[PDB]
């Protein structure tokens, strides 16, 4: 086509979606990770995770307001990944890398899994 | 912080939200523009438009499944802007620029209004 493109549009959209998340506006699901609860937008979770995409396209699970993750999932690893979904920034540290990688594999977040594998390979 | 950032994340999120829109997945509102209807995600509309942000943060309108725009709004201008919201690409043409600018002013989409004003100033 003959379209023009606004370079910062995608980043500005995500920044605003994160602002809605911070003020708990139009969040439509609670993700339960052991004793912790995380409110989010189903659409953002689906756009970032192969697991949430599969969950919310299911004719029965699409209507659930609460999703319980596997008990092996670490709440801090989930929190770091939820922040990454809404910001593009990943708080990857020596102390959390194993939990973050395991959570990203479970959530089917291929690019996060890739950088975790590379950071782990550099330290061996 | 000491975060790392995935450059293409925001663009990949928006691409996936547009894929959900194309398959009519988790759309939660109909925007009525005269005889035309447009299905969309409330969160994406709020993230792109000062008007939709004001509408869906209202304690009564946040719950509406149908929103009727002012009858002066052109359905083609709206369609072009809805496409821009989900893609960052604006199909701006000599034949549609006046309708697109008027629709962007009504929707409170400041960056679109700015480029329309500049393209109009260049042709005078």
């Amino acid at each position: 086509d003959s379209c023009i493109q606004f370079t910062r549009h995608a980043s500005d959209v995500l920044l605003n979606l994160n602002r809605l998340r911070s003020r708990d506006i139009l969040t439509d699901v609670v993700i339960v990770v052991s004793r912790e609860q995380f409110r989010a937008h189903k659409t953002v979770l689906m756009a970032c995770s192969g697991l949430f995409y599969s969950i919310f396209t299911d004719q029965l699970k699409c209507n659930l307001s609460v999703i319980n993750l596997d008990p092996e999932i670490n709440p801090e690893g989930f929190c770091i990944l939820l922040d990454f979904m809404y910001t593009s920034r990943l708080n990857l540290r020596e102390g959390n890398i194993m939990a973050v990688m395991a959570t990203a594999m479970y959530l089917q977040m291929e690019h996060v899994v890739d950088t975790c594998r590379k950071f782990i390979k550099a330290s061996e | 912080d000491s975060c790392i950032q995935f450059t293409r994340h925001a663009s990949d999120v928006l691409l996936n939200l547009n894929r959900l829109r194309s398959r009519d997945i988790l759309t939660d509102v109909v925007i009525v523009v005269s005889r035309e209807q447009f299905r969309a995600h409330k969160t994406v509309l709020m993230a792109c438009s000062g008007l939709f942000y004001s509408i869906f943060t209202d304690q009564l309108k946040c719950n509406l499944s149908v929103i009727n725009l002012d009858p002066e709004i052109n359905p083609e201008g709206f369609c072009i802007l809805l496409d821009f919201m989900y893609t960052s690409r604006l199909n701006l043409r000599e034949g549609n620029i006046m309708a697109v600018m008027a629709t962007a002013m009504y929707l409170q989409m400041e960056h679109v209004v700015d480029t329309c004003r500049k393209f109009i100033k260049a042709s005078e």
Partner: peptide, 4 residues
């Protein structure tokens, strides 16, 4: 704005 750019030409994509």
């Amino acid at each position: 704005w750019v030409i994509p």
